[PDB]
Design a protein around this ligand. Sequence first.
Ligand SMILES: Nc1ncnc2c1ncn2[C@@H]1O[C@H](COP(=O)(O)OP(=O)(O)OP(=O)(O)O)[C@@H](O)[C@H]1O
Lengths: 597, 553, 104, 181, 221
Amino acid sequence: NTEIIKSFKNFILEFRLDSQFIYRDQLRNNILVKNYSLTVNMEHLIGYNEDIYKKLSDEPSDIIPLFETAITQVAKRISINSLPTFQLILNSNANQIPLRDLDSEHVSKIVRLSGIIISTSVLSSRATYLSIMCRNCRHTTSITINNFNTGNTVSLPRSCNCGPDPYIIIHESSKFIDQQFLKLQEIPELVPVGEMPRNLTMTCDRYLTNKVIPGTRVTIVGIYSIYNSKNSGVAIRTPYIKILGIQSDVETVTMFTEEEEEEFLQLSRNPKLYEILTNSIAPSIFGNEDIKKAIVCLLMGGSKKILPDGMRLRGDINVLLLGDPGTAKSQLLKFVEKVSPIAVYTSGKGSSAAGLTASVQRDPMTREFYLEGGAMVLADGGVVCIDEFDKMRDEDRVAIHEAMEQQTISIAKAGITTVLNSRTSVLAAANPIYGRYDDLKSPGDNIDFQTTILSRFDMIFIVKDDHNEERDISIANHVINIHTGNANAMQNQQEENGSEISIEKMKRYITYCRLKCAPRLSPQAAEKLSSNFVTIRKQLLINELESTERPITIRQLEAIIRITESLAKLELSPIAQERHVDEAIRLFQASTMDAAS
Amino acid sequence: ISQFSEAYNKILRNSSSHSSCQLVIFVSCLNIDALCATKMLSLLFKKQLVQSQIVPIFGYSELRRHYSQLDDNINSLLLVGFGGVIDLEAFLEIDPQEQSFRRDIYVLDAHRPWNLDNIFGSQIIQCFDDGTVDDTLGEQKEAYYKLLELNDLSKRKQRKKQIHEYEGVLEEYYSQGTTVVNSISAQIYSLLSAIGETNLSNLWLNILGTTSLDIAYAQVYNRLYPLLQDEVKRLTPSSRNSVKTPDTLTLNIQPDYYLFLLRHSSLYDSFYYSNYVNAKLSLWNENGKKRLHKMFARMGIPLSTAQETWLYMDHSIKRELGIIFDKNLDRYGLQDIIRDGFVRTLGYRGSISASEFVEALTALLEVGNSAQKLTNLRKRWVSNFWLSWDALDDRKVELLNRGIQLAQDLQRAIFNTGVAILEKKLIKHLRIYRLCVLQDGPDLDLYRNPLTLLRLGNWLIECCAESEDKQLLPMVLASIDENTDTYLVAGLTPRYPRGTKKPILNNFSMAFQQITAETDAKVRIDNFESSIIEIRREDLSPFLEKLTLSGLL
Amino acid sequence: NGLDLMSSITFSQQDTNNLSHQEQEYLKEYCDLITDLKSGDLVDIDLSGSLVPPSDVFIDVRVLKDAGEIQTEYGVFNLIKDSQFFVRQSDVERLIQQGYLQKI
Amino acid sequence: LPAHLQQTFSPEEIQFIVENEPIKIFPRITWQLITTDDKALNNMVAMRSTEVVLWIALLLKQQSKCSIVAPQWLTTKELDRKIQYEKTHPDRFSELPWNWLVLARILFNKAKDDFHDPIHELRGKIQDLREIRQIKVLKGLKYLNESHLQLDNLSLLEINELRPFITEIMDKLREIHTASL
Amino acid sequence: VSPQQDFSDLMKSWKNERCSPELLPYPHQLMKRLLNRISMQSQLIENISMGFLDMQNESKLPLLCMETELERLKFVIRSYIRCRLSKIDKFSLYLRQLNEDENSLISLTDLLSKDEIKYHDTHSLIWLKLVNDSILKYMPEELQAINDTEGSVNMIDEPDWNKFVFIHVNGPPDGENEFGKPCYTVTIPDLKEEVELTIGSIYVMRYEVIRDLLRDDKVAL
Ligand SMILES: Nc1ncnc2c1ncn2[C@@H]1O[C@H](COP(=O)(O)OP(=O)(O)OP(=O)(O)O)[C@@H](O)[C@H]1O
C-alpha cells in the first residue's frame, strides 16, 4: 500500500543506469515543457526491481495512481501551484498478443498489442477534481477522480437530514480531463478465418487522445476489463480495454527527429537519389520502369497553388494502368498502398465495404445525421488505388469525375449539405476492353465510351505485353529466383547494404520531403515547355487533320506541370531545373504515345 | 619452456620506447579463446600504458603476408594461437639474426602436439609449452639429443637403426591429433594472478575465455570450473546487499543450462533451438515435438507461457522452474543441463550467462558486417571482427543486442537448413566413418563461415548420433555457393553423451595432410584451422575416395 | 591542411572548378599566406590541427582501409586495414586529419 | 578561425582549464621531473598527502600510482547543509567549489575508488543541488534586465552553457533601450 | 618573473581572450620568453630522453609527463593566436582605420605581434585583391571606396565596447577603489547609476565601462 511510493521515488532518484539515469531527467525535461507526462519503459522497470513489476502486474490498475501522485512529489520538489497530476505512460514491446484471443483471465492484466483502429470518438470531459455542497446544509465539500478504470465508480455521498445526497456538483471550481474512446480492430491478415474481424473500443485519456490518426496500423498496451453499462446477461458486462501506454510504430504525426534530416541530406546529395527509387518500387517487379518511374512523381504530392484568387492547383493528377492481365498492375498498387503512409486500395465497386462515394448515414440514437465517411475522405491528402475502374457503376463513377479536380465533395443529404475537402491523388488501374484489339481500334472506345473519363485523367498507360522470347526468359527466371530459396530476396540485402531503398524509411523520406520543399519552376523551364506543347498541340491536330478520332487539353499540359515539381521535389531544390524538366517531356511523350496508338 | 612472468618481465626491458615499442600482438585468428586473453593483455599494457600494434590475423599464410610485410624496429614480439604445429623458422626463416638476438617472439598456442621445433632451438621462442604439457613428453629429448648430431660399419649401422629407432619414435609424435590443452587466458590469468592482479572483469574474461571451447567438452575445464569457482570464492564484493547496487552490480554463480537463449528468448523456442535438446529429443520431427509440450504438461506450463518472454515469467514460474526441472527433465535424460557456471549481473541492464554471453559474440563472427574475393570476404570477417571485438567492450552492451538478436536469426536457419537435410538422408554411412556433404542450399554465404557449419555440424553430429548406436564417429561435411567450387571442408569429431573417457584427438586433419601431401589438386590448407580445408567439387570426389582410403583411423 | 605533410591542397576542396576561379585563386593564395605564419611558428604550430585539447595521452585508433604505411615521420606504424593501435594524441592528430584514423 | 564554439568556452575547454588546479594526493611512489611551473617535487613519499595540480594526479592515478584526496567540501552528509542552506535561500546560491561539476564527472571516472560510497550517492545528491541551483537560475532569470546582473554564486560549466542565452539577450535589451534614447 | 604567474597571466588574458568581444594588446613581453622557454626545455627534454637509450645495454612517468605539460600548454597558445587571427579579420577595415587615424594607439608591434600585423596587411591586401577582381569592375565611382559611406556603414565596426560580458571581480587588496559597504567598485554606467560591484560576486555588464578594471585586472571574467 502506502510508502511503496518512495520505491518508485527511489527509482525516480536512486536509479542511475550508467552513466546517466533517465526518468528523473525526463521529469525536469517535461517540467519546462509543462508536459505533465512521463513515458515509462516497463521492460526497463523490471531491470530496477524484479518484485514490484509483477507486484505492479498483480493489480496494475490500483498502483496506477501510486505513480503520477508520486511523480509530482519530487517534481513538486523540482517545481519549488497549481500543479495538475502528470500523465504517466508505461510501455513494453516484448510479447505481442493477438486480438483473436482475449481471455477473461486478462482482466486487470496489462497487455501490449498491435492494432488497426476503425475510428475514435470526439473528445469528452472527465473531472479530476470537483467541489460539492449540500443543497440543504450549505456544507462545503470537494471530491476528485484521482484515477479510474465509466463505472460509475463514485457518486454523491448522502451524509450532509440533509438527504438524500444533498451535496451537488460545482463545475467552475471543478477541474477536468478528456477521453478519446478509440475503437480498434485487429490486423486483417490474421486470423479472421472465414469469420469477420472483431473490433474493439480502446480508452484514451488526456494526452492519450489525439495521438493517433483513424485507421492507422498501431501498437498499443493497456488493461483487459469489462463494463456492465446498459445504454447482455444474465448480468453480463460488455468488454472494454484501457490503453496504457500506447507506443505506436512511427509515425504511424508531422514532427520527427533532427538527425533524420541529415541522413536524408545524404540521400539528397546522391546523383542517383531519384534513380535508386526507380529500382526500390519494384524489387520483385521486372521492367515497365517508365510506368515504374511514373509512380514516384505522383508519390511526392501534387502542386498546391493557393495564391489569390481562391483558384488553386490540384493534386495529385490521374494515372491509368489499363492493359491485359499479367500487367501485375493490381499487384503493383498493392505495393503502392504499402509505400504510401496513407493510402486506400480499392478494386471495386468499392473497397472493401467502403462507399466509393463518401456518403451520408443517420445516427441510430437521437435521430440526427452525420457524414458516414468515404474512401476519398479516408485517404484524403494521399494515395488512391483503384481496380475494376471500368467495372465501376457509372453513377458514383460520376462523383469520381468531380473528386479528382475540384477536390471538394458536397452532398445535400438530409439537412447537412456541407462541402468536404478531398486532396487525394487517385490512380486508375481499370482493365481495357477486349484485350489487344482495342489497340487495333481507336485509343478510346474503352472507358465508358467517351474519353471524357480520360479527360480528367492525366498519365494514362496502355500496357503492351509482347511475347518476346529473351524478354520473358529474363523475368521468367526472374520469377523462379523470386521463389525459394528466395534468391532475389537475399539480393536486396547487398542492395540494402550498398545503396537500395528500404522503402519504409523512404516513406518517412517522402513524408519528410512532401512537407518540406515547395518547388517553384524556373522561368525558362516553362518557355521551354510552352514552346513544347504548342508544337504537340499543333502536331497532334496535324494528326487531327485527318479527322482521326482518339486526347489533348490545356489541362494535359498542366498535368505535365505537376511533373515538374514531381521529381524536383525528390531533388528538394527550391526551384525546378531547366535540365530537370526534359525527362518529364520524353516521359509524358511515352504517355502521349498511348494516344498515338 | 619458461615461467610466464619473467617472459613478461623480459618484454618489460624490451617494452617502453619513443617512438614505441616495439612489439605486435597477433590476433589469430577466428577462435575467441585468443580474444579474451588479448584484452586482458590489452588491459595489462593499458595499466603500463604500453603502445603496440593489434593485428587480427585471419589467413594462416596471411601472417607470412604480414611478417614478411611489416617488421622494422620491432625489438620484441608476441603471437597467439599459432606455431604449435608448423614452424615459422620454416614459415619465416629466420635466419638467426645477430647471440643476444635483436628480436624475440612470444608464441601463443593451446593446441597439441607442439611442433618438434618449438621448445628446442630457442630463438624467438620462448617456446610456449609452459606450463601445460612439459610434459614429459620425454620423447622430444630423443628427437634432438639423440638425433643430434648423429668394424666401423657395425657402429655406423648400429647408429642408424638407433636413428630409425628414434626417428621411428619421433615419427609417431608430431603425427597425431591436434588438440587444444586449456584456455590460454587461464595461464595468462595465472600470470595475471602472478603479478597479483585480479579483476572481476578479468576473471569474468577467464570465465568468458574458458567458455569459448565449452561447446566442445571441457575437457580439463570440468575441473577448471572450481579454479574459477575458487576465484568467485576469492572475491566477495560484499557479504550482502547493498542493493542493487546500481553500479557493481556484479556477477554470481547460477544454475545454468545447456538451454539456449534462456533469459533472451521464450522458453518454448529456447528448447526448440537448443542443440543439446535437439537429438536427445529429436526436435526436428513432429513426434518428439509434442513430447516436450508433454513436459510442459508435466511442467504444468501454459503453451503460451512458453511463448512468453523469459523476462515476464511468473516468480512462481521462476522459483519453481528448476524444481519443475527437478521433477521433470531427468525423465528424458535432460538431467544433464543444469550447470553451475557463473553469470554476470548487470542489474538494471540484466544478468547474463557467459555461455549466452558467448553465443552473441559468436553471431558477430559470421555477420553484423577472382581470387581477390575470398581475401575480400575473409577481410570482411576481419572487417566484421573488430565489431565483435567492440562487443568485448562493457559500456557498449546495446550493440551486443544485435548479435543477441542475430544469434536467434542464425539457428532459425541453422535449425532450419540442417533438418531439411535430414529429410533427404544425405549422410554417407560408408564403413570407416559417417560422412556428409552439402551440395546445395540457400545462403551458403552465411555457411561460408567455418563456425556456421561448425555449430551446424556439432548440431548435426550430435543430432545424427546421440548416440544413436553404434560407435560415435567423426563427420564429413562440405558446402558451396560461389567462387568456383570453393567447398569449405571443416573437420568433425564424435561427441560423447556425458560419458569423454578418452581424448581420441583428430585423424583426418592428418589425413587431409595425407592428400595435401598427395596430388593435392584444388585442396587448400589456406585455412589456419587444420580441421577446415578448401576444395574444388571437381577434385574433391577423388579427394573423397582418397579420403575414404586410406583412412588414417 | 591537413595535415603532416598535408601534403597539398590537391584533392582537397573538391569543389575546385565548381567554385569560382577568382576565389580558388584567392584561397590557394590565401592558404599560402597562412603558411607564411607557419614561418612565424616556430612553436611549433601546427594550428591547422591541434583543434582539440590533449588526452590522454594515448588512444586506440583503427585503420580505415588505409595503407600505408606512409608513417615515415617518427616511425612507421605499418598501416593495415582493420588494425587498431595504441598511440599518443600527438601523432594521431595528423593522421586523424588525414582520415587514416578512426576509433578513439 | 575557430568557427565553433567559438565565442563561448567549450566544456572540454573549461575542464581543460580546471585541470590546472592543484590538489592533495597519496602517491605509491617514494630526474626530476623539473617540468616548467610545477616547482614540485622531491620524489614523493608513498602513502603521503601532497598538494599537486589536478591532471598530473590523473596521470599516476591513470597508472594507479597515486591516491587522490577527496574534497573536504565533498561530503554528501556535509553537502546537505548546502542544499539545506540552499532550500532556505530562494535567492542566494550558497557556496561552490566553482569547478565542482567537472570534478565529480572526472572524480568518478577513476578516483571514484578512493571515496567511501560515492557510488549511487553524491551523484544524486549533487544532481539535486545541480538543478535546484539551475532552477533558481531561471526563476531569477525572469528578472533579467540591463545593464546589471547579480550572478553571484554559480558553477562556470552552467555559466558557460548559459552564456549564449543571456549574452545574446541583454545586448538586444541594452541596444533597444539605449537605441530608443 | 615566476613561470607559474608567467603561465597564470597567459591563461588570464587567454581566458579573457575567447571571452573578449574584441582584441587587446599582444603580450610579447612574456609570451616571447615562453615562446623561447618552450624552445629551451623541449630541445633539452628531447636530448635527455636520447641520453636514456644509453642506459639500455625505468621511470618514464616524468618522461612523457614533461611531454605532457609541453603539448597541453602548447595547445592553449594556438587558441590564443588563432582567435586573434579571427577578430582581426573582422576589424581589418577598422584596424586600418584605427591605423590610418593619428590617434590614438596604432596596432604597432605592441597591440599586434609582428606576425599578426603582417597577417593583418597581407590578409587585408589580397582580400581587396579578392574583392577588386571579383565585384569591382563594375566599380561605380562612389562605390569604388571600401569604407564608411557613411552608412550602413561600414566598418567602422566592431568597436562595440557596450556589450555585456561574464566577469568575476578579483584584485589584489591593500589588505583603493573600495568604498563599501562590502567592496569595490563603481560602475557608474552611461545609462545607469552605481550598482555597484563585489569581488565576491560575478556581475555582467558593459564591456566598455569595465575596460578600466580588466585593465586593472581587478575583475576575473
Ligand atoms: N513487371 C513485372 N514484374 C514482376 N512480376 C510480373 C511483371 N509482369 C507480370 N508479372 C507476373 O505476372 C502475374 C500478374 O498477376 P497480377 O494479378 O498482378 O496481374 P494484374 O496485371 O494485376 O491483373 P489486371 O491486369 O487484371 O489488373 C504476377 O504473378 C506477376 O508476378
